[model samples]
Target: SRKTYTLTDYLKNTYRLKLYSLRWISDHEYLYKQENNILVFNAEYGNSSVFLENSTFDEFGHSINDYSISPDGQFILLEYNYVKQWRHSYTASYDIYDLNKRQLITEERIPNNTQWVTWSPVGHKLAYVWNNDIYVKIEPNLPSYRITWTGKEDIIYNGITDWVYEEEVFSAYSALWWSPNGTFLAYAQFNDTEVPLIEYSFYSDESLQYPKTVRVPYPKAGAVNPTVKFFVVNTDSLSSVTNATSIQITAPASMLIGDHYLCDVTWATQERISLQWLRRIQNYSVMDICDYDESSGRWNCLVARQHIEMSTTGWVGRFRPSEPHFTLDGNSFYKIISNEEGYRHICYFQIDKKDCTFITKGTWEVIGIEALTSDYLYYISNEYKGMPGGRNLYKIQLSDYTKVTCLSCELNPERCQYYSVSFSKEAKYYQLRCSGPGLPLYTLHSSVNDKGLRVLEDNSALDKMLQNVQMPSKKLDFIILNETKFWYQMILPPHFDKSKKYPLLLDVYAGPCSQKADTVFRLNWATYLASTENIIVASFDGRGSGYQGDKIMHAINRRLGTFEVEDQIEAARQFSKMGFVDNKRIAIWGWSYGGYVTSMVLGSGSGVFKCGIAVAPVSRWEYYDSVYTERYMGLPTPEDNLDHYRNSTVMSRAENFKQVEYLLIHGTADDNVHFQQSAQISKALVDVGVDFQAMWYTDEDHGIASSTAHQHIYTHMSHFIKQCFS
Candidate 1:
């Protein structure tokens, strides 16, 4: 029964992880999907009930893609005929199913290819974007009401994000937001009339005689970004009025002077909303708090001037400003921001103040604010022993910030160094998810007394199956470069010996504010390679890596391809000196930003790497999206950092790639990082008379994550890696 993990095991997902995913319907009730059936369980007790049967829609004509239950639990929305658009956006036909009636209403069926849909937060009312227009359905069987007549695909978007915002800003397809009580519907309208487009060809299949050209409104670095306008409409009025007006909430005077974006939208209360704005340059950001005035019948933005975040050293927070978790009364809030010394910690801010008081401060950054309650504020951070890769839950007493309690650090310190927790609706209970040096574990606990309720998932089945298999051991440690400590992880082969020199492979993802080496346990490609081939698979957190502080995170800001690229080469050299690593058989590989770094390193003429692979790598900054690229690299114009942008391209370093064996892979339909990036790199390599292997995945996006394609690419990469070592 003793077996070795191989590429087949990984590709076939033989070691699939079982997780306890639940949605809290109430304080004591939680819903989970088991055997394709929706089951609701009581946390206080062990009783469970079927919320929805798996065969409920078996007689329906179409295959159901997903379902969303109403907050009041009266109705359920069925999503089917799904077609993915961008990475975040999608189109699906929706049907309203009345749970009480035991049937789906078809009088006003949602049109096919509906852009996006969502139920209101508090009620059964639903809002959806169809044909780039906003529609509201108060009752499941009721007639639909239109909100905007200016919905156009080429220019106007009523409640959905454009390409840049979908990928770089909101991280979602819909820009619409529902108020807590479902009284107001807030949304951001994007106008892409002036923004440029990226056109590419999509070859459907082998039988297609003509290829369809897809054009997307995409903004690149130093390009004209789409203009956005924020609005909040009264959903109650739209029930009767055919043309109810939407109150436009414009940006602040400071942001109105130039190009800006509405990045964050948070509804503090029923009548109060907070909107964040960032200038085109992205270094400075402002939060505008608007309150409803009953007497004036309008939104008052006087409080906006009291709150603003402007960063002189780097961009505000990581990937735009940190979202504020406001109190129940909407009077105060807490957010994570960089302190004077560059560490990101929790800061308590009063709604009417310009500066926030630091409630928590240390070298480690607060990962996120988990839950806010009347008496306690729960957060996730690496504050325990300052291990940047390690995470723990901390409960801070609202009255006294000094009363900080580590919730899960001592539970299983040896097994679980990293933790992810989920709190109940009222913060009365929580579920702790621990993935680490041991098998993953999930347990439920009461927040009141911190008592363990029961175990959810211990992955016992996986443990039993892996009992006789040879598994790789992970080593999480640090290496010092120049008085600065950087963490690195290695997946050492089973029965590893220090006396034997093994072929080493360096896996990299050195993006700004990205953490490649972490404590989270994974049974990935590295595991397969190391466990079977006896290869030492390693990853390093070099310059531009996050969580340590701004010093390391911002090292490559405005000059991305320099410090981070050089640091990866340095890391390879350090790994080669470990004596257990074969110096001549070292290889490197990365994807996305990591891929960009891999190509840069191979073309660096460092002679530190023997071979490397780059998948969906960015060739130049100018070809990337405006929001992400401009945030770190600024504008690609002569008035700004134009010279550095031109000099940092992978094409300029093409001649140096002749020294190593390179394999370049890319998805043909990658919208995020376009195929042009890789296409340009391949052309440059051909021009320089350098022979390199190349592969293209037809119709695959940036991820190339389709099941069959995922398997094929990894298998191909394995062959190249093994051959390079031989």
Candidate 2:
């Protein structure tokens, strides 16, 4: 039977949906429509329950990206880039909104098109740092006021974090926390003028006679880092322009040197604050809580007064510790997610003592933590074993960490895991949204009934789509050992007959740096493969994928192709074991990293991969950027590590292509993974008189998509799969 789908079916089955992420309340009583830069919430309830729309997305100026809403929910804090100096980036303006007036407060002209603006806890005032100094916003009746001339680029940084702080430590927004009592504002300062500058060139007219190198301030690894200092500003002094002008701010008195990068800062109370500091070794991160005296200038350490020893291994960094929450009234503290025992888990500790106890101990990794109430703490965890398709959410009894039960329902195991959820304050209700396989994304309201049974919202939209597809119960498994997880999903044809034979298409991105094998949302390829071609398609994640922790991700270490290909080989071997899978009809295909990996499998002359398709694959790592490639393989400078690059790259073996039928697809305009990589590798194949098929997209970037281009690419792919396998 001929089973090729028309354009109408393919487009509707895949790209027809305009995906928009919307926020819904716990009960789903109202729905917010977020599209074209406007948010219109349901207004049927009454004028009192008006739709809260974020107007910033529609603004002409650079739209906000990374943003935070204030604690009291009265203000919207935005961080975005604004063009200022020639090629110099800075935070343009910090936006503030008044919940009562429902209007913007600031004039939106703080300067550098790339800076961070933060609001104090109470929401009455705000703070921002420029050129390594801090400034506070003060307003009694008007809601807020900006203090002027409080900082200098090279001199005093009132409330500013340095550039290196932003790049390396993942800390650019460094304004410290405002005390819960809203009495004091604290921030970290950086002295980076002494740090050396590194230059990089941008060729505006690339095809010109000469490309000039324009060097800028760039601090690389093993280079001199910026020195950090701490500062505490008096809230009363920066309250108004009159007070801001009259205050005598001394430089020497304000600056306090910190031992390491100010990774995190939080307020324990109005007078006490906490700082998590990492040592110079790039490990041994510790948290220190300190109390500052208002009347007399004195600082007393609360948590780890001195540097706490963390680990002596290759590297031991603290988990991205969430703000320490003072629970158990005030005597005990709770950390967000700590990789305490080489695995991610939550730990409860005393506010002052060294003894800490693991509260959430399990084999799974915690993805998110929801409500932390007086009685219990609710969180979501993902493991490799039980729920192979998705990460399941669970509510843990906080007091004993013993009683844990799955909170999310079991639906389409493959489609349901990618959904995000948030809980109500009382933990009685939740808002869940899923972008299931083949189904359009949707939101639902879930509530815990009086009998402690959980109920889900009426997802009518999903039910309609679910009814259309003849989905199979695919039970994929992962072999988790050697501290790595290998996961793969197999989708059989829609009209499956056990006696019939089918070709297997392995959709892979085996880049030693990517995760492909895990179970997640239903993608377009898998849906089309099952519904259209009647072919068996498998998507899997193996070594070097993300979120499995450092070890699982870095197990490939500096060695790339060897282990990655082995994992694929293992996967094909497992599939061959299945009674219905045709062992002789397997094709591996990928793009970019996937492309590179596909070449490796084919070059290995592995009988498992009878045919291969590689798109925009890298021929050599040396041709890649220093920052990204160096981070993984270290520096290839002295030329010794070039062997690793050569070993991993497919260019050397391009000419060795033999029985395996192959198709190479690339884009001439791929600036990221250059088209040259493909050309160079293909030439190697030609040098040894090897034969292969090639296709190039004109003016197309990494993702080859557009009118005739997409149609042509898909047509070519479909034809190649049929020719190679059949």
Candidate 3:
């Protein structure tokens, strides 16, 4: 027997990834980590210099979690004693280190249990949030001044997002923004005093006989959402010599008429800022451009500068509104929007004009905007061969949109299809990170000519090691469903034979605007299954998948757990029809949203799957968060799409689950998708007189990401799969 990638290899990261992680501080230089130390490298030439020694903090009395360099490179902020509060939130002790002095700044240092911290864009000025209140230090050694006094725990949040905003809206822990010149600070305030609290028990350890009840402000569907407010304060006026004042920047008159959320905040310049607000319905959004009035000390938004983005088919932009990339002087900007035919493209907008001109027009969607120079705007799109799953970088002239160039398409096109791009500060240089069709490769390039300067990482050592191993292979192809081209991928065993029938596993994650099939390389559980067990693993991106167009992405509008679930069953049927698949041993699995689909598919009574596993699945739409639920299913009330909500739940089909072997797993402390979801499903199964297997992890969050738990879950799942097959 030949050797293959085993579970131990996957768990221990034996075949690890090697990549160059860098942060560009200036146009000419960037920083990367080497040997547990920081090194600065020049852009033009391959030269390295040590920026921070690994042993510098050896005697600092604490294990430093991470480090952040200031804008001017004069000081470093060190975080220690980090305690994760949520997926994106953490509280830690912060210290200031002087790079020039090779010492720590003790006086007026940051306090312990700081919620958030950052440095200004121009200098070493410090700003942090503690106790839900905002604080700023004009100098690192100066005493801090509190900007907001009304910050109350579980009620008022000054510069940090509430739980809903952090998880669903911003995808960050911050609601704070620093102006271009660091002259002003803009932030959003949230009032969660009236929001409902979700209480859960945490049996953390044996230290206590009784567990702790953790309460978080979580608003379910049709619940009272958190109230929001925006403000900007001039940092220069904050001192002992003068009273600090925060000017209120209210939403538009129409937006204030009902519930809304501050979806985006962008600083165009030192004096101009942009705010995007969306109604609770999420189909409509408005962008306001405001300029600072020095004479009156106010921020003014002219009636002409207001922009409206609306959709009749689905929710606005990806997750939220698209951010604007403004010009140097803030007179004009470029943004991504859907064209009339339902494709996403870039449009150039003047601050005062209500009508904007389209700069890009195509059937393929533009995924992101990388950088904007004076002459060109660079972006990533799926315009190469119309594959929809592959990404390519392109640049177009700002003055004339006809002059377009593809930068990364021709560079080893066979081995590289999906690319991640990063541009330097001034757009002088960029890095291309290619992840798939082959091994991971990274290279640096000059923007002036779009020339590949040097090979950064090529995984040469890993290739040499794999020379003797029988690695599995992948097939990236498509399946036509309902008269449209749908993409899919499969992992096959080494030395595979289509004449021999093999067991099949359909991995599903068909959330709205979600794509499961792509070109990214991975060494994950599916890979181990194919290599070790000789089973074929497949993933299909069907209707409601992202990056195709609104026609596909919005197919699941106002309807959840319907077409997506149907498509997975159909795709699995299509896979079993192939010559290589053993239909009798077919199984399915998913996590989170995917988990919900897996349960729904197994319960469909379609007889497509023999067994399935669902981890941290959602049983009903009404039990989920408001922003994400309402965006797709409207609300759970009597008037709004309640019929579909009542019919689309996995719990309603509990009797059908008796036809298949099912495994349900969840963490007790899951805040995102609560353990209540899985418990509800289990209760439904019991009510239906169905017997199934279930497991729960104590004090674990959504990911169940603890080290021991991670390994145990996989090992347990491996055993379940093997038993079901045997």
| CA lDDT, every model vs. true structure | 0.89, 0.58, 0.90
Tens digit of lDDT per residue, candidate 2, span 618-649?
77786553334544554454554556866777
Model 2 TM-score, all chains together: 0.70
Mind giving the per-residue lDDT tens digits that candidate 1 earns over 30-128?
888786799998888758999998988888899887888898789888888889888889999888889998887989888888998888998899888
Model 3 lDDT, residue 49, Cα: 97
Give TM-scores for every candidate, taking all chains together and pairing residue i with residue i.
Answer: 0.99, 0.70, 0.99
lDDT of 1 at 494: 93
Give the poorly placed runs of model 1, Cα more than 4 Å off.
239-241, 303-305
Q: Quick one: RMSD of model 2?
A: 7.0
lDDT, candidate 2, equals 0.58
Off by over 4 Å in 3: 241-243
Candidate 3 lDDT over 1-726, as tens digits, reads: 558899998888888878888898988898997867899989789698999889888899999878899998999999999999898999999999988887898999898989999888888877799999999988877889888888899999999999999999999998899898889999889999999999999987898898889999999988999999999999998877565799999969879999999999999999999999999999889999999998999999877898999998889996788889999989999999988889889989999999999899888989989999998999999899788879889999987888999998889888898998988889999999999878889999989999888998998887887666778889988989868889999998998999999999888889887878887788899889999998888999887888998998899999888888889999989999998888999999999999999999999999989999999999998889999999999978788888998998899999998899999999999999999999999999999999888889888889999998899888888888888887
Pick by TM-score: 2 or 3, better one: 3
